[PDB]
Short mmCIF file of N, CA and C in Angstrom, two decimals:
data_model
loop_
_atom_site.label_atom_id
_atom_site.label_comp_id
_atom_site.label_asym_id
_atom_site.label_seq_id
_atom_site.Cartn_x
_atom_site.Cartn_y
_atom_site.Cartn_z
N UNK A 21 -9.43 21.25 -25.97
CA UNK A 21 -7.95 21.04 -26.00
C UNK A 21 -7.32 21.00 -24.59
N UNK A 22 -7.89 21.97 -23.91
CA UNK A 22 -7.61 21.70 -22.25
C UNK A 22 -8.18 20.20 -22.11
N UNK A 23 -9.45 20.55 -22.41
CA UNK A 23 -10.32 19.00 -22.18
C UNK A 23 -9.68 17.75 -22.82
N UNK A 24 -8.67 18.07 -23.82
CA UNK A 24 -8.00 16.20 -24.47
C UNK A 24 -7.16 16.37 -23.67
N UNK A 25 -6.75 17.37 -22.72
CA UNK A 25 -5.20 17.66 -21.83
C UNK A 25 -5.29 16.50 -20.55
N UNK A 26 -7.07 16.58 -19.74
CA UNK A 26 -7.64 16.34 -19.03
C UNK A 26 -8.06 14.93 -19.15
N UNK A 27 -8.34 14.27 -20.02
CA UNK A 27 -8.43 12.81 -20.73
C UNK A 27 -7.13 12.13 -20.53
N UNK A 28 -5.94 12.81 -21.21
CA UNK A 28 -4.87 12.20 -21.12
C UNK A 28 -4.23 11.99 -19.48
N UNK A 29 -4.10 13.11 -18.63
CA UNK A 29 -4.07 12.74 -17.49
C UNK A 29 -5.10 11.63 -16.84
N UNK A 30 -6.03 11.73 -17.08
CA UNK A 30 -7.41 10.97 -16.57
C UNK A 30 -6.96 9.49 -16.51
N UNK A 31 -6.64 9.15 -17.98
CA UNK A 31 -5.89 7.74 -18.69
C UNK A 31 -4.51 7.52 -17.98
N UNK A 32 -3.51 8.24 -17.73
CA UNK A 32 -2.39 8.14 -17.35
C UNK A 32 -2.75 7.57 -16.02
N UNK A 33 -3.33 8.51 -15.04
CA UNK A 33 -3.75 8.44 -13.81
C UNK A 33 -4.47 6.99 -13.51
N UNK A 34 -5.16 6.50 -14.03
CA UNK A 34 -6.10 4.76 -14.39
C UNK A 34 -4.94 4.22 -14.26
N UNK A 35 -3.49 4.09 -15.10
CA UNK A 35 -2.48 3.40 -15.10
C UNK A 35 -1.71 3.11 -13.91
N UNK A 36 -1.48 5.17 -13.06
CA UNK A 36 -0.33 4.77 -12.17
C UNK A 36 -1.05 4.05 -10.90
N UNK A 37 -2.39 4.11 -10.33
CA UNK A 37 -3.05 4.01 -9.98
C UNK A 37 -2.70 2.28 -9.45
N UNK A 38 -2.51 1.96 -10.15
CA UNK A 38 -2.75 0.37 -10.68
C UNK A 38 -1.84 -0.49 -10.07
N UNK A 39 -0.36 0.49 -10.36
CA UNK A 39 0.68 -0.04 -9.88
C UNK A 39 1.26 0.78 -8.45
N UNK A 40 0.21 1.08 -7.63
CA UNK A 40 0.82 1.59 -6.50
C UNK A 40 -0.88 1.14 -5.43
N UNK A 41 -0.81 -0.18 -5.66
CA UNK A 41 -1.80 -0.69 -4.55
C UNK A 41 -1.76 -0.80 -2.93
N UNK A 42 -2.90 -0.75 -2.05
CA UNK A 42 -2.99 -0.58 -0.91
C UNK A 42 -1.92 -0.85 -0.02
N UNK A 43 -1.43 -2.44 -0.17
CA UNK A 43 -0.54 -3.22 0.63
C UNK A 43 0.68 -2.45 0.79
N UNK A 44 1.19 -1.49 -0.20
CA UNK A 44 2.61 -0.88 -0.46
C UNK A 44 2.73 -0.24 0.73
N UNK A 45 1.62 0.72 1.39
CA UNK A 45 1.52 1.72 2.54
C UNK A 45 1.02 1.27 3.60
N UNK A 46 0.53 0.09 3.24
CA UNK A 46 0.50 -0.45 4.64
C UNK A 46 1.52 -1.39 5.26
N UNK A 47 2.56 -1.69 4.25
CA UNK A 47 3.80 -2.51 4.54
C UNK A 47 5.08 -1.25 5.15
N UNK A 48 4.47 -0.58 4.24
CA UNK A 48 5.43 1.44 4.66
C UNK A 48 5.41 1.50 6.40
N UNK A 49 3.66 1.24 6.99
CA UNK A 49 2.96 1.75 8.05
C UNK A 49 3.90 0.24 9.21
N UNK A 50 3.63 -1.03 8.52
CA UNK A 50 4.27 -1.92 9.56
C UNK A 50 5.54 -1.85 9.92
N UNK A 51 6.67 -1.85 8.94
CA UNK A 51 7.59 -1.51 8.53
C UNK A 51 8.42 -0.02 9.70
N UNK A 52 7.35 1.36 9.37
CA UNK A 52 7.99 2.44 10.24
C UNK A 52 7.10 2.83 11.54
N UNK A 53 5.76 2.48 11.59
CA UNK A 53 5.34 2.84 12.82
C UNK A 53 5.34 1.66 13.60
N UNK A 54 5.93 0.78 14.05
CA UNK A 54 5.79 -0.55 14.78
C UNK A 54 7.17 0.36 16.23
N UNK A 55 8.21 1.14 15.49
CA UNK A 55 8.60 1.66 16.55
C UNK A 55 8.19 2.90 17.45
N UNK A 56 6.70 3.15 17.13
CA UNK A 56 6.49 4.53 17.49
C UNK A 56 5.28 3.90 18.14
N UNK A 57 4.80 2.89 18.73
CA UNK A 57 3.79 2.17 19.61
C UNK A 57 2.51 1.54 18.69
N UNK A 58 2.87 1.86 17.52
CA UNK A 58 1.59 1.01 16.69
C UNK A 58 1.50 -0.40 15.95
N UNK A 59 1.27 -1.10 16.75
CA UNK A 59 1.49 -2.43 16.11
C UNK A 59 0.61 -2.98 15.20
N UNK A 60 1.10 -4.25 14.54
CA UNK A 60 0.81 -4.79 13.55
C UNK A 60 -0.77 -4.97 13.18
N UNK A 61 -1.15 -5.54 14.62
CA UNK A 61 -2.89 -5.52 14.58
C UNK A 61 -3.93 -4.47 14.10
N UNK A 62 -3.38 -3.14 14.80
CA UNK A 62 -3.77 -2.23 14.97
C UNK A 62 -3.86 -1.33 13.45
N UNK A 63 -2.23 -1.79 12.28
CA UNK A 63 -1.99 -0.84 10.94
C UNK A 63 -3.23 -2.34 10.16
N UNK A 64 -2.94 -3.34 10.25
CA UNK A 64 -3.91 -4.18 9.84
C UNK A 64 -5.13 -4.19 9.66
N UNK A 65 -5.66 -4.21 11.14
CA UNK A 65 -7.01 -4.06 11.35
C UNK A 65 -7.62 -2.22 10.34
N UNK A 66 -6.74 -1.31 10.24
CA UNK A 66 -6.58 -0.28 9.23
C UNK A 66 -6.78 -0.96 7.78
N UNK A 67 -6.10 -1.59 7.38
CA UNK A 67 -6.04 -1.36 6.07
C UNK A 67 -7.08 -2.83 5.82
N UNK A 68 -7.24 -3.99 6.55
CA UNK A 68 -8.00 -5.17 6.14
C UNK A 68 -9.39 -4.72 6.27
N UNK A 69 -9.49 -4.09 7.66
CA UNK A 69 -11.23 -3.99 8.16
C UNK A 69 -11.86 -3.22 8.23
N UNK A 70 -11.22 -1.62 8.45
CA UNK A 70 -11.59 -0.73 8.27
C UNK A 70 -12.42 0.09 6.98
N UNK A 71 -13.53 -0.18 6.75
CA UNK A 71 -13.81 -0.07 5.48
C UNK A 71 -13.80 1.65 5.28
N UNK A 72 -14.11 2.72 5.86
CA UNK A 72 -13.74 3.85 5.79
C UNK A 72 -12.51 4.13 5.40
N UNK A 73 -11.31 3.83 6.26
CA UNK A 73 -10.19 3.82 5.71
C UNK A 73 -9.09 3.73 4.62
N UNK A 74 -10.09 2.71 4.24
CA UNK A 74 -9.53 1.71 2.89
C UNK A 74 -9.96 2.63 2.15
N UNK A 75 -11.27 3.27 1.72
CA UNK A 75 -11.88 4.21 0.93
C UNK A 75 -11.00 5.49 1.17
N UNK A 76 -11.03 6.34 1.94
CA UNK A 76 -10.23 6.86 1.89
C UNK A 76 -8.73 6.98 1.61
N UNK A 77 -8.08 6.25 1.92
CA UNK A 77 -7.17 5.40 1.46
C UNK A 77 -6.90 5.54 -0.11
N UNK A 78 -7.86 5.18 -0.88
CA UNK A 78 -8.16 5.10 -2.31
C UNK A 78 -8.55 6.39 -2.74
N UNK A 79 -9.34 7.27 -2.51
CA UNK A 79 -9.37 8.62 -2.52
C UNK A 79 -8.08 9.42 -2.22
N UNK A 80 -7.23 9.61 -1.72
CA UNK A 80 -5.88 9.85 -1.92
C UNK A 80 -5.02 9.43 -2.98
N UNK A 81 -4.67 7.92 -2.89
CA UNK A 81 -3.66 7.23 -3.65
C UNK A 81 -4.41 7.76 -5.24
N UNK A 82 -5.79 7.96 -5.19
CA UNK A 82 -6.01 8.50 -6.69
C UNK A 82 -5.84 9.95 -7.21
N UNK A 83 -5.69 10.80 -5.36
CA UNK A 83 -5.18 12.12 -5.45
C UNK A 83 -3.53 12.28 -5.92
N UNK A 84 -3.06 11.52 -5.29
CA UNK A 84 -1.87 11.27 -5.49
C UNK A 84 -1.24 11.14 -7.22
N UNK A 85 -1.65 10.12 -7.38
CA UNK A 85 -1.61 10.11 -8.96
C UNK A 85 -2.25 10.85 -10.03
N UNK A 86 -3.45 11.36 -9.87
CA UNK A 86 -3.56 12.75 -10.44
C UNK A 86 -3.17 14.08 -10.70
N UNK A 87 -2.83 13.83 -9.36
CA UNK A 87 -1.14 15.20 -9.45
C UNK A 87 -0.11 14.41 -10.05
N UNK A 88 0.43 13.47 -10.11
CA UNK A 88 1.41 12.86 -10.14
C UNK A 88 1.23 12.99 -12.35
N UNK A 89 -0.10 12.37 -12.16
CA UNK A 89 -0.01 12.71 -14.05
C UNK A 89 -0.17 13.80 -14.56
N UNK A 90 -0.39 14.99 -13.86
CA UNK A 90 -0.78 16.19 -14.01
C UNK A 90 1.06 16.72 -14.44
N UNK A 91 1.88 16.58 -13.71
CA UNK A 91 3.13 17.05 -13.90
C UNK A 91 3.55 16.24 -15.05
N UNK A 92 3.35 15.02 -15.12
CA UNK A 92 4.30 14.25 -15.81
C UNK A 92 3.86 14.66 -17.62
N UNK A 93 2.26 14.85 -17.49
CA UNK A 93 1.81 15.53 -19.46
C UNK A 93 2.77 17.16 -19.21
N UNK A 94 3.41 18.13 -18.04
CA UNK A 94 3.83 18.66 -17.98
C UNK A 94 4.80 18.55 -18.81
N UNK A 95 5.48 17.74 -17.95
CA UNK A 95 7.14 17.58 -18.78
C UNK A 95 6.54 17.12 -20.41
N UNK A 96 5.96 16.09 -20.76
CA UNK A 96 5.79 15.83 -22.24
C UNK A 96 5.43 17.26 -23.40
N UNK A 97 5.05 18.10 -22.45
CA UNK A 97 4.58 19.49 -23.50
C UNK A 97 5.57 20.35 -23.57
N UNK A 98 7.13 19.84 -22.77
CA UNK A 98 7.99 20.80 -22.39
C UNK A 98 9.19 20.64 -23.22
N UNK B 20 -14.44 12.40 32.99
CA UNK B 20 -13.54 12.78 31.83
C UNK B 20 -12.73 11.56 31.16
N UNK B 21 -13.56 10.24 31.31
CA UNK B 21 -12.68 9.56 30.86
C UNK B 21 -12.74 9.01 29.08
N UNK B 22 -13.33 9.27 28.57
CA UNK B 22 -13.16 9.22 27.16
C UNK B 22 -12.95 10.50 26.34
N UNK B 23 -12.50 11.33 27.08
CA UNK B 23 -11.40 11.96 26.40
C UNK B 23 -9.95 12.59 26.91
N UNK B 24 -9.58 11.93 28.06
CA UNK B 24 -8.49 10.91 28.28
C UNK B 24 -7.83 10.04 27.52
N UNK B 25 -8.98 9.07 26.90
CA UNK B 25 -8.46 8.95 25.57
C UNK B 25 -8.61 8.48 24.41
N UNK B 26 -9.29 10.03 24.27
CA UNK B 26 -9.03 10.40 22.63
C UNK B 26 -7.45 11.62 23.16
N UNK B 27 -7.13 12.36 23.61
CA UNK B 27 -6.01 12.83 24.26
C UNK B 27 -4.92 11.84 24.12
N UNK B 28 -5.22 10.84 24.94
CA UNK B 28 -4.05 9.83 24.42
C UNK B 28 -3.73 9.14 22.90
N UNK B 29 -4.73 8.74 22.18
CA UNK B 29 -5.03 8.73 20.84
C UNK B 29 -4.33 9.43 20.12
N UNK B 30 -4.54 10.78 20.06
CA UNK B 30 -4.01 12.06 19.44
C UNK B 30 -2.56 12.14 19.42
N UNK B 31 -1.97 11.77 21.19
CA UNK B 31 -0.56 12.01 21.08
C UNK B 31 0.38 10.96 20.97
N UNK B 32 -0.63 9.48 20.67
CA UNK B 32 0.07 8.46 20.39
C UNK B 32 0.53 9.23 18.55
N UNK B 33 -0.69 9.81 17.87
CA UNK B 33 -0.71 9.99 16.56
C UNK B 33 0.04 11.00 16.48
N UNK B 34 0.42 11.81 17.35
CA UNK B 34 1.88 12.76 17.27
C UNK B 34 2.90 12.30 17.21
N UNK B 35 3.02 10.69 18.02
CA UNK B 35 4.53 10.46 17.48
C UNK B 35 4.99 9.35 16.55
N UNK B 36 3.69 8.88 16.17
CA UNK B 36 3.76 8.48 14.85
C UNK B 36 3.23 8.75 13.62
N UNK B 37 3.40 10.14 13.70
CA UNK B 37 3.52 10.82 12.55
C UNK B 37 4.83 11.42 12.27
N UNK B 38 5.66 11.07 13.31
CA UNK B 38 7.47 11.36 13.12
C UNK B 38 8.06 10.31 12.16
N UNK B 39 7.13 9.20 12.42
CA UNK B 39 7.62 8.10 11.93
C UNK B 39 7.46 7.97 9.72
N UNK B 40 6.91 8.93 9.62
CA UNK B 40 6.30 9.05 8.75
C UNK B 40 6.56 10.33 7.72
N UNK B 41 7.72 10.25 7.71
CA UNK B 41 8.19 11.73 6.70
C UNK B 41 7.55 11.69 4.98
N UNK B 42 7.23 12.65 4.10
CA UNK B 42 7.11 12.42 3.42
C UNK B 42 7.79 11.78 2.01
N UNK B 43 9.29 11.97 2.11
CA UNK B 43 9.91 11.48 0.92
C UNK B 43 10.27 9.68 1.13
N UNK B 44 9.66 8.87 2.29
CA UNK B 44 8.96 7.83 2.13
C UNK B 44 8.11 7.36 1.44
N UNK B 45 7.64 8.62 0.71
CA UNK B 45 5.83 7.90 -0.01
C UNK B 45 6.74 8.35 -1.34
N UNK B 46 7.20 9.91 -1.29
CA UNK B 46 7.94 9.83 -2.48
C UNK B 46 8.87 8.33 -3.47
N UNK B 47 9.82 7.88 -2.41
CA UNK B 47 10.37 6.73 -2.79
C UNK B 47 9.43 5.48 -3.09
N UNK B 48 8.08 4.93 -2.45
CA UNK B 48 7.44 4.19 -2.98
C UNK B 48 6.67 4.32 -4.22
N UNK B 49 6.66 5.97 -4.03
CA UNK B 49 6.46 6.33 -6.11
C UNK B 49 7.48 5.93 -7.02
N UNK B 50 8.39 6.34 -6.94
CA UNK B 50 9.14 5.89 -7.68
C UNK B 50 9.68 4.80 -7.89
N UNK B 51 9.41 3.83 -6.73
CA UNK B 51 9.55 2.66 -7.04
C UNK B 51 8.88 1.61 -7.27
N UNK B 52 7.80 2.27 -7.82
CA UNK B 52 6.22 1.48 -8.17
C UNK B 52 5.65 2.06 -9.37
N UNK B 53 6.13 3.81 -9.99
CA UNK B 53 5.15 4.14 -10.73
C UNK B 53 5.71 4.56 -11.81
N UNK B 54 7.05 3.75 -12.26
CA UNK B 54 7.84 4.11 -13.32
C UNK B 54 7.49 2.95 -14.16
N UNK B 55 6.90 1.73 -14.04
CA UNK B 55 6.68 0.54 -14.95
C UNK B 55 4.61 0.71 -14.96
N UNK B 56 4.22 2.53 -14.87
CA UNK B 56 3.16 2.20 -14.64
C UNK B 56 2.46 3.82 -15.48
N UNK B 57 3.30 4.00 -15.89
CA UNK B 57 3.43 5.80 -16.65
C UNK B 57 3.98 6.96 -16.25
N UNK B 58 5.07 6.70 -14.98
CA UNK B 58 5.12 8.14 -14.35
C UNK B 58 6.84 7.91 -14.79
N UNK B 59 7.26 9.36 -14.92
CA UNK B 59 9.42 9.22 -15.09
C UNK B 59 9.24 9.65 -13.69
N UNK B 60 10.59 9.71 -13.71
CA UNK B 60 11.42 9.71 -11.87
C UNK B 60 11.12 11.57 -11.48
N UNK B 61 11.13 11.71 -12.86
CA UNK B 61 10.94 13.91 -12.34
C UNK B 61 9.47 14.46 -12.13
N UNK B 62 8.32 13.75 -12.85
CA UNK B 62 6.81 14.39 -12.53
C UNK B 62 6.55 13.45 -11.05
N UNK B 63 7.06 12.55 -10.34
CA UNK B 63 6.91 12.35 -9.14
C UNK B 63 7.69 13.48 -7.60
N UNK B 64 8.69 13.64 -8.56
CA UNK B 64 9.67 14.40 -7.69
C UNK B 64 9.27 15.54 -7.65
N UNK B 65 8.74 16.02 -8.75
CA UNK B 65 8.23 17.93 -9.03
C UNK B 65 7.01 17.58 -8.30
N UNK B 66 6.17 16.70 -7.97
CA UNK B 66 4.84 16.60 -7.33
C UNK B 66 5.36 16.77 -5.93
N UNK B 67 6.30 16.00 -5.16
CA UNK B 67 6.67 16.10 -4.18
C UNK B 67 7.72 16.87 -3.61
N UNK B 68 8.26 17.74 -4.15
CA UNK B 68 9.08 19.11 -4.02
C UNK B 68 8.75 20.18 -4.92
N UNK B 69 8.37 20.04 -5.85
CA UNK B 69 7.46 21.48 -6.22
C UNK B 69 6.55 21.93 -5.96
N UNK B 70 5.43 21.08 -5.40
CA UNK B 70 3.95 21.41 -5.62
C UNK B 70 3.26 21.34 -4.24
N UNK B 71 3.31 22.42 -3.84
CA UNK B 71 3.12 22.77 -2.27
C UNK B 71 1.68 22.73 -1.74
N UNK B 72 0.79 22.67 -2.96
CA UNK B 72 -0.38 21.97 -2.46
C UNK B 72 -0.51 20.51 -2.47
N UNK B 73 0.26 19.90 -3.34
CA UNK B 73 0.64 17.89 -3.46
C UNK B 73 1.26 18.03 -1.90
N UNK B 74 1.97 18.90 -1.19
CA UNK B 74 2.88 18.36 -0.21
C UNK B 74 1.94 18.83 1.29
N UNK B 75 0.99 19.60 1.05
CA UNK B 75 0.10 19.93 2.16
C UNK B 75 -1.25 19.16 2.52
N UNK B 76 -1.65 18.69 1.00
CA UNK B 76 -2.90 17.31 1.25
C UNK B 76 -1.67 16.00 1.68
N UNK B 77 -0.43 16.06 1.26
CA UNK B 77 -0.05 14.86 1.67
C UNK B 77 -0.01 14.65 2.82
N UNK B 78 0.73 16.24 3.66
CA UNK B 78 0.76 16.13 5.47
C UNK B 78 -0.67 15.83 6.01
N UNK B 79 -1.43 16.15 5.33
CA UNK B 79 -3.21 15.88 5.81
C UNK B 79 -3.40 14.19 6.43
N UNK B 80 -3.33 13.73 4.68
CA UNK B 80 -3.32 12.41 4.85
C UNK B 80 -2.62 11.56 5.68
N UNK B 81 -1.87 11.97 5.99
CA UNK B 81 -0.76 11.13 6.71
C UNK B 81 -1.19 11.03 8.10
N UNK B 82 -0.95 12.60 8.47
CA UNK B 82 -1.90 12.97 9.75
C UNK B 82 -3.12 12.17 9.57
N UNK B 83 -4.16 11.65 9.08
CA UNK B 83 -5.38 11.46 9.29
C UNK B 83 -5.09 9.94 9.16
N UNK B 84 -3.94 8.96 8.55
CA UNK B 84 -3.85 7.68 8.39
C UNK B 84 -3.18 7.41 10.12
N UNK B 85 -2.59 8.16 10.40
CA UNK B 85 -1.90 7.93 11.71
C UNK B 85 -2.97 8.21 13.44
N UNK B 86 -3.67 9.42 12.67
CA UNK B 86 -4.72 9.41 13.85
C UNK B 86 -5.86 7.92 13.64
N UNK B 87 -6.19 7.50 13.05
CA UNK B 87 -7.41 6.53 12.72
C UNK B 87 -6.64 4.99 13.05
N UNK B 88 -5.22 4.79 12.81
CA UNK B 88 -4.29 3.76 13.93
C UNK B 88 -4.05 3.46 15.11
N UNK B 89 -4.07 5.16 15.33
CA UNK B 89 -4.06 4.96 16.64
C UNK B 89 -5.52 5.07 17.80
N UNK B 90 -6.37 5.60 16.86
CA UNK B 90 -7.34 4.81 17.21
C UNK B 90 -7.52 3.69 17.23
N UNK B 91 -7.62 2.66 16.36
CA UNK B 91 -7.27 1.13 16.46
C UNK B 91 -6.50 0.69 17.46
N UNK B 92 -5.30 1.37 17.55
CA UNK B 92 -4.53 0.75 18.52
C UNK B 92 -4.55 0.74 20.15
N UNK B 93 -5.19 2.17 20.53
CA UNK B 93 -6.20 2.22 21.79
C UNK B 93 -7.21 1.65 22.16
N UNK B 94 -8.26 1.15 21.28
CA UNK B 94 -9.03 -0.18 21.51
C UNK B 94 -8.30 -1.13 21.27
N UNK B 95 -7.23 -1.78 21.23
CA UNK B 95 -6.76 -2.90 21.62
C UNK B 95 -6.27 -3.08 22.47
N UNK B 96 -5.62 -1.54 22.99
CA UNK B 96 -5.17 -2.05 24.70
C UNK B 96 -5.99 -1.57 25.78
N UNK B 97 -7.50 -2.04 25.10
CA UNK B 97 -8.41 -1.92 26.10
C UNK B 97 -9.91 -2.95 25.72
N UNK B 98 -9.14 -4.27 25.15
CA UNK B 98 -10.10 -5.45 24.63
C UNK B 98 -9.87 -6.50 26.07
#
């Protein structure tokens, strides 16, 4: 019952996942660090070539939304 | 001492663009991406003002997306 708790986040999380792809934070990154000396090449060459990055990258954004569905079956039990 | 000169410079390029980079920025791209995707406007917001371990991996990440730029960006002004 914890464990169907854990499914349902699991499933939720697959969803938000989906709709909050790479480009969003790296348009965030061109967008606010271009005035703080980091240019375009540089958040690019990050998110196009960097293959570590990108992975990591994805390892977050799925941290992210796991907490993110973790609260939200919150509110539904509330 | 010259390659870590700069990684030194690296680091404090990534100090000040990590100013650039507050967190209720990422908050707002949640919510404006993850409401047509299963999330309401309050389990994003309670993730990002309630949940003080969601808000301490987030300073991580951020820190670690901004140091690895500016790495990038120090080999370019030295191609």
């Amino acid at each position: 019952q914890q464990l169907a708790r854990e499914e349902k986040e699991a499933e939720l999380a697959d969803d938000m996942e989906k709709g909050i792809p790479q480009h969003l934070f790296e348009s965030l990154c061109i967008d606010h660090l271009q005035r703080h000396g980091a240019s375009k090449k540089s958040i690019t060459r990050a998110f196009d070539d960097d293959v570590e990055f990108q992975e990591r990258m994805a390892e977050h954004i799925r941290y992210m939304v796991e907490t993110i569905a973790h609260h939200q079956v919150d509110i539904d039990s509330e």
